[PDB]
Amino acid sequence: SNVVLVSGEGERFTVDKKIAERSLLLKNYLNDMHDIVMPVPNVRSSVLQKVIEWAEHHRDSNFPDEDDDDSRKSAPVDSWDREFLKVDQEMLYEIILAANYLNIKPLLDAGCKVVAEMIRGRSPEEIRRTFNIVNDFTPEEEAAIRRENE
Amino acid sequence: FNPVRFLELPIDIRKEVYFHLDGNFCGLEYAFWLRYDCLVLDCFKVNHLYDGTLIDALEWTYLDNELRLAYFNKASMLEVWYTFKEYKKWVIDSVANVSNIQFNIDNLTPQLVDKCLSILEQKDLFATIGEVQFGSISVIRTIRSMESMKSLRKITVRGEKLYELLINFHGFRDNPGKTISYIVKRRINEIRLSRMNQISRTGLADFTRWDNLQKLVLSRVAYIDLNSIVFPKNFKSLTMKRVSKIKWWNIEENILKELKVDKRTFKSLYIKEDDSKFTKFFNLRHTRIKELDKSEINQITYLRCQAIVWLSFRTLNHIKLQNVSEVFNNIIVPRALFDSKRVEIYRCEKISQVLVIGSRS
Amino acid sequence: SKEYLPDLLLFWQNYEYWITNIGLYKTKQRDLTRTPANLDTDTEECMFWMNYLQKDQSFQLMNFAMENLGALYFGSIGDISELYLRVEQYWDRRADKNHSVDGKYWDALIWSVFTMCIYYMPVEKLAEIFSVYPLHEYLGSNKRLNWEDGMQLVMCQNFARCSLFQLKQCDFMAHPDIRLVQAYLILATTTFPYDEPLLANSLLTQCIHTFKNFHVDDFRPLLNDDPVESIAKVTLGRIFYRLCGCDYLQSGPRKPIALHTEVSSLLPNVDVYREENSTEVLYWKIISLDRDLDQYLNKSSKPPLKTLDAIRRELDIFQYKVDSLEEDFRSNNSRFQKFIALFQISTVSWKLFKMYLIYYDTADSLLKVIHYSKVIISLIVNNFHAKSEFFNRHPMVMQTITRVVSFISFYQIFVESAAVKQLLVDLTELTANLPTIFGSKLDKLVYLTERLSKLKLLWDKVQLLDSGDSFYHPVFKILQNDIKIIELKNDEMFSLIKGLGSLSDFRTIVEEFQSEYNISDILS
Amino acid sequence: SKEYLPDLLLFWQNYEYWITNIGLYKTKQRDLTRTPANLDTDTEECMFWMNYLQKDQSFQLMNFAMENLGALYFGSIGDISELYLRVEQYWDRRADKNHSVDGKYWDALIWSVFTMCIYYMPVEKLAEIFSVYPLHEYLGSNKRLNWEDGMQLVMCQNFARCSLFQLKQCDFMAHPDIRLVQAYLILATTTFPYDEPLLANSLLTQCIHTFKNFHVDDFRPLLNDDPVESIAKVTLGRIFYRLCGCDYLQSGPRKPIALHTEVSNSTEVLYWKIISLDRDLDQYLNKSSKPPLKTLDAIRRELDIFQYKVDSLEEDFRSNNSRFQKFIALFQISTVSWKLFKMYLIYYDTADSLLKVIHYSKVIISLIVNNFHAKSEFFNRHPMVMQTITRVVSFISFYQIFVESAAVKQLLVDLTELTANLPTIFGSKLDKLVYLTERLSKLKLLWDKVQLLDSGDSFYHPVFKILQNDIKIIELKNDEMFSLIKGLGSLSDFRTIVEEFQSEYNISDILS
């Protein structure tokens, strides 16, 4: 018994039901009445294929919990996940958007840990010294800071 | 890294990005430009926008001869620091009224604690300050000022030297200036404890004086005894962080003294039938929970068993447990806090026996 | 510019509180100088609707409820095999010329059970059991109507009135007893609280007074109790939580005396985490999630995201408990229980992501609204099959669609999208295919949606003006005056004065549209 | 030792909450398996009992109410000459076939006014208006019964029942309107809250629902208001304060939905302020706590202020309404004074307390004996004198049992003589009050003839066990757990003396 996901571009993908129970949405979209195809809008087919490959990898892995706020902080940076999400930034944000829409907490956590490691190790005094979305900052206040820089 | 697409990115995903990015904003530190990032102000705007459920470690300090807000790392390294007019202006930018600001005593010096409290009182507010972090001249200096401290909700007390003087009921001494003033005890909504070994030694751990407790945190304590501890009226929560071997309630000794049945015969009385319906979602894999057989008991006797369970368990909603590594006396919890996700054990492979009483109908 | 949208979405909360919730179900235009007095005292009418029934018909109704409808009454009355003796006692005591108060209480309870039996029976079984003909011989209506033509609801409402008449013969105000409350908890499953909301609020205030007379707070029994006393406390607790659910489903500006002392899940003298979770307090927990969402409708403040995320977490928890309910489907009582819990959990999910769309505009919130709307469409269309059409008769399918098909209409006025139009076509297909037992109420819903459809056209042909500070368009004035008219129709000061007293093309287009499509057509 | 007196005076608070208040007035022994459920719903009864009243008799009732009863209905319906038009409309509309709901509301209001006219009328004019013989032709009782035998109470109860029947024809459940609250507050002037107690509690919960339907929480006139709305909010404030008063006069265990949100045109404000002071006094009956001295001293200072305000009030002799108002206000402030100094005597044992109790008790006796003459005999028919004299004779008898004094004895003889001289419109409550006084006197004789003992820790006497078992029996009788069980399914010589006293002098005789 296989379950067909539908991407945004239209390519229908086919997984198994026990595989698709990694999603916390297939488990509550197929459990209506026992007496098969789930659309996923605004997801490009390559992104949903990568999400399906991630779900096919961790078929028998013990993720910690849903409400364990300290195990998420004491972070396991998994090896295959760190090898997996090594793409450019827009592919990464589309995977994280898809994981939020598919209600998949571990992939969301892994993607946000990768983005957290990116935003943690930014260039000191090169990109941190350039604030760029400048709002609620007057030219007088910006001039005061740049005068206080010397 | 593009911080202009990351800001047009929506709210809760960006929250989940900052959730794993709590203290380590950088990685030794160029603290001039690190404050004026758009990302740090985004962190504090979202953090003010929920309730403060992120880092929340905002201190009042007296640095560079000025009273300013400061955030410290998990290893107590200073990350950012704001003037209060600045933080007010960008909280107003976020909301388009601050009341939750922590106050250490341990991360300060008393010669500047006195000046901090004096200028913070006489300047404008002496308010907008929620937590008070105790754990001895500076302590008594803080106690004299808590009568005017209008909106506080938390007290944390560190190791056993300061605890038994202030929190426990055992004293009833004649020093009004040393202890609380009973108007601060009315709004005392949470209490955390840390860095101690035994809560109940040299007396008894009785919280009956402190009205209005809806939460409680026991963190990094060696040996506690729940049988000794009594609890106030209208008590709600119970959270315990990493502890050593502790004793639980005497519930199983009271079921054993009810049915007049032996220990080994009760070990064949605890069924393990309904373990595959919903407890597989709990992802325990070490503690196989066990219930009582329906055929091996009557109805009214089962209701009396539930009544025995709720005694010494009167008002509690959820019990949260980190790694405790041992529990002596026979965990036997009610299903009304177990069938919903209230009784939450998280990392306990050393615990093995969990008994649950109640109908799963 | 397209920045008029967030203030308008915030205005949707006010419009949803006053038009869809209060003004459609819970508002009755009364005029005390024109209502006929009750000089009949419902004696001839309920005399007919009591001797119309026969014995075999009553036992077939009881067998239908015994094998189907157990998830509704099983918390209220308990097990219905005890009640066959009470039906036998009624048909033996029918010949008696002197009744007691207790016997008339049991008779009112079983007449309420018969009202629920009439409300949840499909048209084929109801035509095979009952006869259309003597009612048209009596009621003087058109003799061409059938049960599917609108006469099942008339018999249901008259059986509810006869249950209330047998309550009137008890002097139920002079003798407080539990068989009032149980009877109302059988009458709160039909559309009786939506027919007469004033009478439902009065009976519910009597039920609150009757419950609080017993002075029971904790339903966990003690160790020094009679076994009968402990079974009494358990049954009283089930009655209490069903009463709290049926109490929140009638709130508004005409229901001032609340029973809501039940503390919601983790923001209050009755903390609802202590009871062993049966069907009834599970239904109450889902209604408590619903009431924690829908208190920010008329309030001016915005809800915190901490609360909405806690609602999401607990929503998934009870979502998984519904999956792990684990009962036998061969008896099909668990099927209807599963449908109730699954439809309520989808409704609460939909309201959560609607407030996510409105108040904070978060990641793909509109897409999640479309997704849960399709889930509600699936859960209703799946019961268009045989043997389970009456599953679409539980009154929560009238509420939720009224929340959905309004909102997806309203958003369609202002934001043009591709998926939203197909979703609105699906809702327009679903709204006509709902069962006809909601009657005029269902008709009113279609009118409201039709008015909103016309409100798209006036948005298109008229250009948005600009004053720099605020925006001006006739749609804004008409949507404002709808709330103004219905808030005027819920002002009882003029009833007080009747009691003890002595008594620009903008404006043109607004008056034309309000003269053509009046909002007061939706008032009951 | 003689240490039982302060704990026994604290026990008097418990006994006065349960026995003199809840047991005698606010407890109805019901049995649902034997009570006839009236299938007729009193149509056969009230059809006759509304055909009995005649038109000119009703206008003489209205004239009597206008002349002598103003200080009652001014809180509810204001002026009664405005109500003459509604009475004319009813007597013209009575011959019709169909009826309207608003008309039946006005009918319920004027029938409640008729009940208030019947309950406070003197016996000579009442005999000149109404006959006696059709009453006994319907009821089948003795022909030799008179109005002083109790037929006036029967006519009052039947008019109250027919007012309720007109409310039942309104479907007042499904049509809330303000005339329900007024027509109940006119029925709250009588002892209708003591005939059918839980029916009165259900009607009062309906009145609270009807009041809170309006959603008016502040009664002050604004500037941009219609003046009709300002007059309506002033009148609604008057109805609200008197409804808080009549709500406080029906509290207990069988009435949990209370209206008391207020804390602590001149007359009604004075009336509610005195009743709210009475509320702040008698909130310590059922409690286990005790009031502070500053609380009782503030109550005494405000008591002296309102005493000067009553001294600042006037009285008119040609206008009997002003004397009626003056007697009601002065008796209320004397009752509040007596309860204050009773709490002084009980709680703190302060000097010059018992003399104040005897002083204000004699003031109460003088205010009643002043009305024993002609032209003002009906002033003793208000329910406040029944409540007050019940509390007074109960506390004086309980004090005479355990403390002997000659002035207290002469006071008890005066109370006992005045108790039998109360009018026969209170009836069964008066007879059970006399029975309770006789039971406490025989309890005094039992205290005299039996030695008090002590085992070294606490005392032992039959009087203590009897007084404790009275509270325990009446707290057992005020439980609805047995009715809930019947609703869900069909499921030594010391002891000899106590059992003989309980077998001879039973406690269940004061119930209803």
Numbering used by the authors:
A (entry chain C): 4 to 38, 75 to 189
B (entry chain D): 4 to 30, 88 to 156, 164 to 202, 257 to 482
C (entry chain A): 54 to 320, 330 to 565, 588 to 608
D (entry chain B): 54 to 317, 339 to 565, 588 to 608
Q: What did the study's authors say about this model?
A:
The centromere binding factor 3 (CBF3) complex binds the third centromere DNA element in organisms with point centromeres, such as S. cerevisiae. It is an essential complex for assembly of the kinetochore in these organisms, as it facilitates genetic centromere specification and allows association of all other kinetochore components. CBF3 comprises two homodimers, of Cep3 and Ndc10, and a Ctf13-Skp1 heterodimer. Cep3 provides sequence specificity through binuclear zinc-cluster (Zn2Cys6) domains homologous to those found in GAL4-like fungal transcription factors (Lechner, 1994, MacPherson et al., 2006).
Full-length Cep3 rendered CBF3CC relatively unstable, but the complex with an N-terminally truncated Cep3, in which the Zn2Cys6 domains were missing, yielded a 220 kDa complex (CBF3CCΔN) that was purified to homogeneity and was suitable for cryo-EM studies. After refinement, the final map was calculated from 187,606 particles, with a resolution of 3.7 Å judged using the Fourier shell correlation (FSC) gold standard method. Secondary structure details and side chains were clearly visible throughout the CBF3CCΔN map, enabling an atomic model for the core complex to be built and refined. The 2.5 Å crystal structure of the Cep3ΔN homodimer was fit in the map as a rigid body, and this structure is essentially unchanged after refinement with a final Cα RSMD of 1.1 Å. The most striking secondary structural feature of this model is an eight-stranded parallel β sheet. This is part of a larger solenoid structure, corresponding to the predicted leucine-rich repeat (LRR) fold of Ctf13, and comprises eight LRR motifs, rather than seven LRRs identified previously (Leber et al., 2018). The remaining flanking density is an α-β subdomain that decorates the C-terminal end of the Ctf13 LRR, formed by insertions within the last 3 LRRs of Ctf13. This subdomain contacts and stabilizes a typically disordered acidic loop of Skp1 such that the Skp1-Ctf13 heterodimer forms a toroidal structure in which both the N-terminal F box and the C-terminal α-β LRR-insertion domain of Ctf13 associate with either end of Skp1. The Ctf13-Skp1 heterodimer forms the left side of the horseshoe and makes extensive contacts with the base, formed by the “proximal” monomer of the Cep3 homodimer. The “distal” monomer of the Cep3 dimer forms the remaining side of the horseshoe. This arrangement positions the truncated Zn2Cys6 domains of (Cep3ΔN)2 at opposite ends of the channel created by the horseshoe. Ctf13 and Cep3 line the channel with basic residues that are strongly conserved between Saccharomycetaceae.
